[PDB]
Symmetry: C3
Subunit: 166 residues, 3 copies
Amino acid sequence: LAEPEIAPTAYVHSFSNLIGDVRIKDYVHIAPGTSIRADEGTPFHIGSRTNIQDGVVIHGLQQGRVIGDDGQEYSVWIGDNVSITHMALIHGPAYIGDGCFIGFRSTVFNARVGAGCVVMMHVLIQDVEIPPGKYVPSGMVITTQQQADRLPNVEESDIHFAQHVV
Amino acid sequence: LAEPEIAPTAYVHSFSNLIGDVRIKDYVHIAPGTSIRADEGTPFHIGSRTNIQDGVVIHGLQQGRVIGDDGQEYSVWIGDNVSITHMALIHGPAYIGDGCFIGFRSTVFNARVGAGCVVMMHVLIQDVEIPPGKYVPSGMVITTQQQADRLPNVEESDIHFAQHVV
Amino acid sequence: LAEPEIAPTAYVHSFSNLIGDVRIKDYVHIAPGTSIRADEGTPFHIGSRTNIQDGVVIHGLQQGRVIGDDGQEYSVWIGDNVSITHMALIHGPAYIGDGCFIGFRSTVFNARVGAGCVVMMHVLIQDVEIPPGKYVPSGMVITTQQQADRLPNVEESDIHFAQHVV
Ligand SMILES: [Cl-]
Ligand SMILES: [Cl-]
Ligand SMILES: [Cl-]
Ligand SMILES: [Cl-]
Ligand SMILES: [Zn+2]
Ligand SMILES: [Zn+2]
Ligand SMILES: [Zn+2]
């Protein structure tokens, strides 16, 4: 496999299982207890200032890609200023836009989550595109575009909540 | 504890925490980031060509067994050609039949899942017997036999989905 | 960081990622595959005879504390005789009282769970106080005090179930 590209100012805990063509940008913080393996789906991108918390798995299917902001194909693209919180599963093909909060134990698989979404806890997002700036309440199972298209907009209190957590 | 029995053609990543009387058959693939410990409930069986993905825990209660295809008691029996996908929890006593797909973050505990089931994501299956060839949609919490007995049959698109993932 | 205080009779598996001011009392059993890091929120308390099972993460927010039984502030307080079962997430600020069962894949975050509760599988408890002696059925997402105030009392069969698991 290709080697990870780890920006000089990124922090990757030595316990993180980081493998393959994972392109990690400035000031990223990858916690212990994480698995970020581009051994099937590849490449991955993790944007600047993004935090990957303990218990997260990031993996990808061999087949299936999203377009990154650079126009290249990725198995997983996670933007800048994103929080991928404890036990989240981000499984390629997946795009998560800048500034998103992905709350505890939530999954994004075969999906695009627009910039500035606040996804709460114990959520499944699969097989859909979530527009930018949407809020997903805890426990929601979003598997159809019809559901995704009904989601509420992020409110000030949702932004406040996310900022408080991270 | 007894030692694992690892078939010559099985692959067990060195990071896997594999302990006790775990009987692993031909062409099994056990990923890093897995825990498969027969230190309480024992023994375990993992059938040929089965894949155990990163984030899975397989454990068992000291008391409580299922009958394997060989007539012996097991804490956990997982058949041939099974996919135990990321973050699944298979907790003995448990039987999972040949050809099952167990989707991301799903749990099987004190239960039997018949051959050829397609269990989707964020599912709980507990205290029930799922007949062969049933589909469990994402997010379902199955804790009574009445619920298990209402499940739909696997359709071609469910089989196609599972094959595409694995 | 301060060092953990590990009681002489506590068992902490060498694979456990245990960091910071974590105060572990008599006869505690911490499994492999656990993460218990007081590197942000701190301190933590884990009471006597409590079991932390494989797959659990215990972490805390930098800001936000609960009052322990000793009157001191904690990020996470887990009482005596508690079972924190596989893949549970206990995230500070959090208080879990003596004798609680926290079932598989359940989360307690920014919440107080009174002594003697039986919390089942795939539960979220967030932003609430659960009174002592309440039962939370599997799959419940408890995010408001109104929901918490409707919970049923633990019955003999719930106690029997918990004892049987642990
Ligand atoms: Cl973390
Ligand atoms: Cl999980
Ligand atoms: Cl894997
Ligand atoms: Cl354990
Ligand atoms: Zn995968
Ligand atoms: Zn167990
Ligand atoms: Zn945390």
